[PDB]
């Protein structure tokens, strides 16, 4: 209030500052003395907010009002207590957050200036919280509460004391201080302190409302993320955790709204897919956990629960226990075999009743694939052909289950819930494909049987009819289903193509939408299926969904053969101008190869290079991402194949699992000798203004791209291209700049030799860069450039390392922003002998600077 | 068994809380059971899985350290417990129930509790047998150890403790005399002397 | 809790040697076998005793007070030791003598046992920390520890780690007052920190240096004596890798532990004040050099540990700057790295959404 003297602490000494500011502290307390002396002083109806806002503002602005002696200490303790009494009232809830911010940021300030005071304050706060949780225990423990209480900490003799009369008070104060702790964890974290935090978290969790339990769950997550859990705390935590999991299915929706996110966060962070995360855990705990997982599963939980998310956490945990935890840690092996067997029986039992069964995919595939590997291995003892049906009970059970579903649907669409059943068949097919491909160590000498081609034909009959008479109501979901099905089918047939007719037939349903309504051309004339499917096409084409449409288009683009190829290419071009940017992305990501199948293995499509030249930058992002192997497409016949493309490394919400392939030359992938005349149609993407994401994706593709393209050939156009490229380094985007810095390594790994002209353009463009930098004074750009040069040098071989070294050495003669201190040491990857290598040029690097003296 | 022993031990622990009439109910049949299940006759323990007896002795040391010996009312039940302790000392060996050291711990603690009661009760007879048994066991083990003159009081903490307690009661008389309880203190002194005599005579056997 | 049984019966106590407790008891081949059998009998007796554990149920009211996270009193455990100390002696008796390759294995196993015990029991802790007349086990460890470190025996790689896990768990499960019993550690921590030691050992020694630094009379035992000083060893180490396996993740664990140590020491209230900042800068430049290039949001756990370390180091350095205003002078040698990092790390932390008024204030101060 006495703003002038408040600001001008003035003559107030380090010893008298305390007293000079005692009066300001008195004024602030007078403020707090009344507006917040008691809880219901006002109908909260929520002006007082301005008071806490001023507390926070003056905290941020003038530290001396609080700190700089013991008076300052009890002052806060006096203040804090005036707040805690507010954090206990329900009606005051809408301030409790402002209190989570007032208490917070204040411990912060104290940390910034007077750590020791912060440490002692934290110790009092923690002794307080400990008393509170022990009281919670004693309360639900069935012992005395004596609700009239003191909770005597932060004790201030300055001159109301603290008391929680109802579990409203205790729960509220606890949740508030708990949020504060979730903020200040790191500042408070220490060795012996961590066990205390663990103890109070476990107290809350074993005993507390569900809300406080979720809060403490997030808290414990941050704790395990900061310092891991020791043994002393575990047992309690795990008992609580498992009892909670068991209680889940017997839990309410809102209750689920509480436990939903933090529980999944905790489980993912405490049971992560990255291996060696189990060593932190005492096996006994994990065996108990697996027992309770089997129990939850064996109890029909998955149909009983509601949150599709939480089921995702469960499936993730199961995937962990399947693959990343090695048998021999959780328990002996047979116990694990038995458990997983039973849980998989259940995971099977569920599928026909859910609409989205994907989360069942990771673990089901994981078990199928584990057994496949162990089987091909034990029999790798002695080609070696094998059959799968009679091998694993899970496999043939899944098989006959898919059969039961296909059939019960075959009897009537009405007697069957179409979507869940089509989904069951589709997931079984997805698993058949994923496993027949990757499980087959031949792809990694053994071969293995899988689901039946007659069954494939059966379902191919069934799907159209289910659609053909779905009453036009649920059709759309069925389009999505058939999309997924055909996707699995097509991944499979790519691994091993089938008899033509089955492949011929398929091409119809994939082309279904755009056959009837508008084709009316000769492609459908010479096409067989079209005349057969005219009626269903006129029934359906208008119903196809844009996402699903682009899906089908990408699928057809995947459809490889000298089979209706003209028609596939026709529809690909048609959709190339489809008015649907999703469809345009699919169009590019499929034509990139659909054309190399067509003819003219010479250069890129003019049609595409123009279409891409237009807007919908996402199209150009994927355009570069696909260019990455369009280069090799205009090379040896593209030998389509998949990466491991397994589901977990991807987000799992996979649309068209087939959308993971990136092909290669059929054989003899000679030096592409790419004259770069095609890169010009491509590099135009790098106009220095396109969305940085596309430029970054192209910088990424540069890795694969380097080897193919040739550089000595046509020095002129190649050098123009390289200049277009080095237009990157001065790009205003930053991540693109650093990525180009890192990939100049790949480039100069491709370069045949260190010609002079290339070193010449290097020096020219880097001088241009440093000049634009200092003329602009863009230190960020200076750092990007120093890193680009450091990479070019650490990778360069000949006279170039000398040049980048000259540049770094000149940079060493500059102001704070001299990253060289890092680089010119990195180049060692013998400072004295290395100087000797260029001692003579090195000294020259000095002379010009010495022209200053 | 396990079920029966859980019930039995929980019942024992609850005893001191039992009231006069409910006590009356449990009084005779419980002593009868425990005598028919824990008799001095040797080899009657082989029927019993040792862990059961260890759990029993645990709850027994607990009840005794729980102040029962002087709280409880039924002389029948205090006699039964004394009989059980006398069984765990004499009729049963060591090694079957458990290792020795923990056995010594228990018996020493219960003997301390028993030393705690002398001046209180008027009839301490039931208190006698178990003590004499422990003291004979010690005296024997001690002379055999020496056989690899000797005194007692210093050897066993329990002996010296007992003699000190007797002296304490004698002085308590000397100072306040008659107002001090003229009875059951004499009984404590007289049992101290009874044991002095018995274990001077029998525990006898220059060294 | 009761899980002590499961822990003791864990099939491989250490990965390798396939030696469980059973493989310790059933060995008819210091005590002279006049106590081997007796101790084995104590062992299985205590096994039964704990397999009962009526205690740690329905709350165990007695559980509470000091001994942060009160360790559930498992009195049966108290009976295991005479065995364990028999073997720790046959390690000691076999030591102090100018083969042992076998006996030392039983000793490692028994040390793992004692580790689990001290982890989940409180009566054993009261005993050991009690009687100076230290329970023979404590001395059996300490007279070994020097031999655990001074001698780079092929097996001295492990016995040390286990004795350290034991000492540290015992300092954790216990209270603050008894630590003056731990006082004996300081005569041996230096050898425990020699550059000939591997990452996991120095790590435990740091954790324990902290657990002692919580004690009033104990902090100076950090660098009461300015020379050698049980520091500048930690820093010469954190800077110049004396280990070769040196799995970067391990070095991150160690940076993190050293940081938490520095922070506790600074807040609780040598020539060494000077080297610390040099080492922190070397460390930090060791971090910022890693994550920057990867950029974007760190989905990697290693990246998250690194970020936590960087934020904590920044706050720590702000406290430093609050002290020893010559910090710029002592920083002169590395001001290059310092100003080649500080701006980028400030940019980063600003990018972080978990920012703190402390982080912002500090990064601005520099």
Swiss-Prot record, chain B:
UniProt tissue specificity: Ubiquitous, with highest expression in testis.
Regions annotated as coiled coil: none
Location relative to the cell: Nucleus; Chromosome; Nucleus envelope
Free-text description of this protein's post-translational modifications in UniProt: Phosphorylated.
Organism domain of life: Eukaryota
UniProt disease link: Seckel syndrome 1: A rare autosomal recessive disorder characterized by proportionate dwarfism of prenatal onset associated with low birth weight, growth retardation, severe microcephaly with a bird-headed like appearance, and intellectual disability.
Family the entry assigns: Belongs to the PI3/PI4-kinase family. ATM subfamily.
Purpose of the protein: Serine/threonine protein kinase which activates checkpoint signaling upon genotoxic stresses such as ionizing radiation (IR), ultraviolet light (UV), or DNA replication stalling, thereby acting as a DNA damage sensor. Recognizes the substrate consensus sequence [ST]-Q. Phosphorylates BRCA1, CHEK1, MCM2, RAD17, RBBP8, RPA2, SMC1 and p53/TP53, which collectively inhibit DNA replication and mitosis and promote DNA repair, recombination and apoptosis. Phosphorylates 'Ser-139' of histone variant H2AX at sites of DNA damage, thereby regulating DNA damage response mechanism.
Assembly notes: Forms a heterodimer with ATRIP, forming the ATR-ATRIP complex. Present in a complex containing ATRIP and RPA-coated single-stranded DNA. Binds to DNA, and to UV-damaged DNA with higher affinity. Interacts with MSH2 and HDAC2. Present in a complex containing CHD4 and HDAC2. Interacts with EEF1E1, the interaction is enhanced by UV irradiation. Interacts with CLSPN and CEP164. Interacts with TELO2 and TTI1. Interacts with BCR-ABL after genotoxic stress. Interacts with UHRF2; this interaction promotes ATR activation.
Name of this protein: Serine/threonine-protein kinase ATR
Included stretch of the parent chain: 266 to 529 of 2644
UniProtKB/Swiss-Prot annotation, chain C:
Name listed for the protein in its UniProt record: ATR-interacting protein
Superkingdom of source: Eukaryota
Physiological role: Required for checkpoint signaling after DNA damage. Required for ATR expression, possibly by stabilizing the protein.
Placement of sequence motif EEXXXDL motif: 359-366
Free-text comment about domains: The EEXXXDDL motif is required for the interaction with catalytic subunit PRKDC and its recruitment to sites of DNA damage.
Subcellular location: Nucleus
Species annotation: Homo sapiens (Human)
Family that this chain belongs to: Belongs to the ATRIP family.
Tissue expression pattern: Ubiquitous.
Subunit record text: Interacts with ATR. Heterodimer with ATR. The heterodimer binds the RPA complex and is then recruited to single-stranded DNA. Interacts with CEP164 (via N-terminus). Interacts with CINP.
Record PTM text: Phosphorylated by ATR.
């Amino acid at each position: 209030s006495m703003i002038p003297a408040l600001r001008e602490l003035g003559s107030a000494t380090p010893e008298e500052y305390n007293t000079v500011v005692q009066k300001p502290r008195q004024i602030l307390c007078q403020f707090i003395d009344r507006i917040l002396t008691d809880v219901n002083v006002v109908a909260v109806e929520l002006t007082s907010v301005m008071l806490l806002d001023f507390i926070q503002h003056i905290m941020k602005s003038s530290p001396l009002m609080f700190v700089n002696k013991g008076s300052c200490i009890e002052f806060s303790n006096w203040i804090i207590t005036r707040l805690l009494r507010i954090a206990a009232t329900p009606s005051c809830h809408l301030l409790h957050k402002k209190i989570c911010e007032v208490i917070c940021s204040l411990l912060f300030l104290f940390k910034s200036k007077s750590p020791a005071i912060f440490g002692v304050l934290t110790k009092e706060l923690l002794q307080l919280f400990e008393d509170l949780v022990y009281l919670h225990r004693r309360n639900v423990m069935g012992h005395a509460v004596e609700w009239p209480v003191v909770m005597s900490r932060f004790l201030s003799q300055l001159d109301a004391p603290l008391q929680l009369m109802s579990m409203q008070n205790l729960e509220f104060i606890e949740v508030t201080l708990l949020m504060v702790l979730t903020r200040i964890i790191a500042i408070v974290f220490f060795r012996r302190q961590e066990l205390l935090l663990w103890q109070i978290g476990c107290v809350l969790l074993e005993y507390g409302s569900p809300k406080i339990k979720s809060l403490a769950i997030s808290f414990l997550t941050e704790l395990f993320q900061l310092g891991g859990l020791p043994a002393q705390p575990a047992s309690t935590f795990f008992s609580s955790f498992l009892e909670l999991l068991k209680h889940l299915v017997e839990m309410d929706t809102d209750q689920l709204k509480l436990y939903e996110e933090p529980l999944s966060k905790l489980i993912k962070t405490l049971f992560p897919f990255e291996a060696e995360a189990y060593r932190n855990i005492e096996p006994v705990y994990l065996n108990m956990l697996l027992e309770k997982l089997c129990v939850m599963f064996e109890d029909g939980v998955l149909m009983r629960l509601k949150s599709d998310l939480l089921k995702a956490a469960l499936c993730h945990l199961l995937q962990y226990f399947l693959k990343f935890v090695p048998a021999g840690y959780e328990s002996a092996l047979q116990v694990r075999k038995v458990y997983v067997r039973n849980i998989c029986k259940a995971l099977l039992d569920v599928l026909g009743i859910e609409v989205d069964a994907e989360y069942l995919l990771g673990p089901l595939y994981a078990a199928l694939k584990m057994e496949s590997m162990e089987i091909i291995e034990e029999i790798q003892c002695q080609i070696k052909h094998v059959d799968m049906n009679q091998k694993s009970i899970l496999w043939s059970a899944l098989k006959q289950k898919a059969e039961s579903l296909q059939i019960s649907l075959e009897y009537s669409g009405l007697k069957n819930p179409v979507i869940e059943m089509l989904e069951g068949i589709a997931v079984v097919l997805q698993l058949t494909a994923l496993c027949t491909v990757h499980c087959s160590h031949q792809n990694m000498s053994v071969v293995i049987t899988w689901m039946s081609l007659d069954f494939y034909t059966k379902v191919l009959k069934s799907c159209r009819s289910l659609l053909e008479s779905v009453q036009k109501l649920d059709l759309e979901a069925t389009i999505d289903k058939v999309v997924k099905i055909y996707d699995a089918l097509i991944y499979m047939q790519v691994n091993s193509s089938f008899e033509d007719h089955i492949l011929e037939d398929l091409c119809g349903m994939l082309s279904l939408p755009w056959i009837y309504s508008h084709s009316d051309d000769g492609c459908l004339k010479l096409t067989t299926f079209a005349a057969n499917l005219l009626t269903l096409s006129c029934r359906i084409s208008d119903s196809y969904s844009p996402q699903a449409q682009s899906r089908c288009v990408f699928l057809l683009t995947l459809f490889p053969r000298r089979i209706f190829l003209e028609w596939r290419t026709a529809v690909y071009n048609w959709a190339l101008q489809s008015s649907h940017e999703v469809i345009r992305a699919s169009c590019v990501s499929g034509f990139f190869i659909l054309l190399q199948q067509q003819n003219s293995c010479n250069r890129v499509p003019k049609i595409l290079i123009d279409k891409v030249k237009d807007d919908s930058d996402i199209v150009k992002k994927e355009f570069a991402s696909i260019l990455g192997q369009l280069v090799c497409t205009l090379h040896g016949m593209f030998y389509l194949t998949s990466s491991l493309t397994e589901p977990f490394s991807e987000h799992g919400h996979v649309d068209l699992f087939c959308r993971n392939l990136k092909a290669t030359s059929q054989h003899e992938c000679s030096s592409s000798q790419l004259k770069a005349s095609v890169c010009k149609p491509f590099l135009f993407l790098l106009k220095k203004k396109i969305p940085s994401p596309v430029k970054l994706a192209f910088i990424d593709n540069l890795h694969h791209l380097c080897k193919h393209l040739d550089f000595r050939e046509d020095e002129t156009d190649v050098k123009a291209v390289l200049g277009t490229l080095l237009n990157l380094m001065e790009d205003p985007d930053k991540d693109v700049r650093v990525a180009f810095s890192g990939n100049i390594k790949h480039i100069l790994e491709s370069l045949d030799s260190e010609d002079g002209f290339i070193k010449e353009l290097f020096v020219l463009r880097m001088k241009e860069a440093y000049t634009h930098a200092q003329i602009s004074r863009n230190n960020e750009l200076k750092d990007t450039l120093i890193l680009t040069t450091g990479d070019i040098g650490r990778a360069a071989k000949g006279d170039l390392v000398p040049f980048a070294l000259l540049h770094l050495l000149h940079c060493l003669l500059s102001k704070s922003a001299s990253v060289s201190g890092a680089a010119y040491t990195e180049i060692r990857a013998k400072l004295q002998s290395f100087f000797s290598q260029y001692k003579k040029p090195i000294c020259q690097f000095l002379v010009e600077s010495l022209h200053s003296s | 068994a396990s079920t029966f022993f859980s019930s039995f031990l929980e019942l024992l622990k609850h005893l001191v809380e039992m009231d006069t009439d409910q006590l009356k109910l449990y009084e005779e049949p419980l002593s009868k059971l425990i005598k028919t299940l824990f008799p001095f006759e040797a080899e009657a323990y082989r029927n019993i899985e040792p862990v059961y007896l260890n759990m029993l002795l645990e709850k027994l040391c607990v009840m005794f350290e729980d102040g029962v010996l002087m709280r409880l009312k039924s002389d029948l039940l205090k006699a039964a417990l004394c009989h059980l302790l006398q069984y765990f000392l004499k009729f049963v060996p060591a090694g079957y129930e458990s290792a020795l050291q923990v056995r010594k711990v228990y018996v020493r603690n219960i003997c301390k509790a028993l030393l705690d009661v002398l001046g209180i009760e008027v009839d301490a007879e039931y208190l006698l047998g178990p003590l004499y048994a422990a003291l004979k066991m010690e005296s024997m083990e001690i002379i055999e150890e020496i056989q690899c003159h000797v005194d007692m009081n210093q050897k066993s903490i329990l002996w010296s403790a007992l003699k000190q307690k007797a002296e304490s009661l004698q002085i308590s008389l000397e100072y306040s005399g008659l107002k001090n309880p003229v009875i059951e203190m004499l009984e404590g002194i007289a049992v101290v002397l009874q044991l002095t005599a018995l274990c001077t005579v029998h525990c006898s056997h220059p060294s | 809790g009761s899980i002590l049984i499961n822990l003791l019966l864990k099939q491989p106590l250490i990965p390798g040697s396939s030696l469980s407790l059973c493989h310790l008891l059933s060995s008819s081949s210091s005590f002279s076998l006049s106590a081997l059998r007796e101790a084995q009998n104590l062992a299985f007796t205590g096994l039964n005793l704990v397999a009962r554990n009526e205690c740690s149920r329905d709350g165990d009211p007695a559980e509470g007070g000091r001994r942060a996270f009160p360790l559930c009193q498992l009195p049966g455990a108290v009976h295991f030791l005479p065995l364990v100390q028999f073997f720790i002696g046959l390690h000691c008796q076999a030591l102090q003598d100018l083969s042992v390759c076998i006996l030392e294995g039983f000793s490692v196993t028994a040390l793992s046992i004692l580790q689990h015990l001290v982890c989940h029991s409180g009566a054993v802790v009261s005993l050991l920390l009690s009687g100076q007349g230290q329970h023979p086990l404590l001395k059996m460890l300490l007279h070994l520890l020097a031999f655990s470190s001074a001698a780079t025996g092929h097996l001295q790689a492990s016995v040390l780690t286990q004795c350290l896990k034991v000492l540290v768990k015992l300092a954790e499960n216990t209270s603050c007052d008894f630590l003056p019993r731990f006082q004996c550690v300081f005569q041996v921590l230096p050898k425990c920190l020699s550059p000939e030691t591997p990452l996991p050992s120095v790590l435990l020694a740091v954790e324990l240096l902290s657990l002692l630094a919580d004690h009033d009379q104990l902090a100076p035992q950090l660098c009461s004596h300015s020379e050698g000083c049980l520091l500048l060893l930690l820093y010469m180490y954190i800077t110049s890798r004396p280990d070769r396996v040196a799995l970067e993740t391990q070095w991150l664990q160690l940076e993190q532990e050293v940081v938490w140590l520095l922070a506790k020491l600074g807040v609780q209230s040598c020539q060494c004040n000077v080297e610390v900042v040099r080492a922190l800068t070397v460390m930090l430049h060791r971090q910022w050099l890693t994550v920057r290039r990867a950029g974007g949001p760190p989905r990697t756990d290693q990246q998250r540990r690194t970020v936590r370390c960087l934020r904590d180091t920044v706050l720590l350095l702000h406290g430093l700057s609050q002290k020893d205003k010559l910090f710029m002078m002592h920083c002169v040698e590395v001001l290059h790295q310092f100003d080649q990092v500080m701006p980028g790390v400030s940019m980063l932390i600003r990018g972080l959404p978990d920012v703190t008024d402390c982080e912002e204030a500090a990064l601005d101060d520099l």
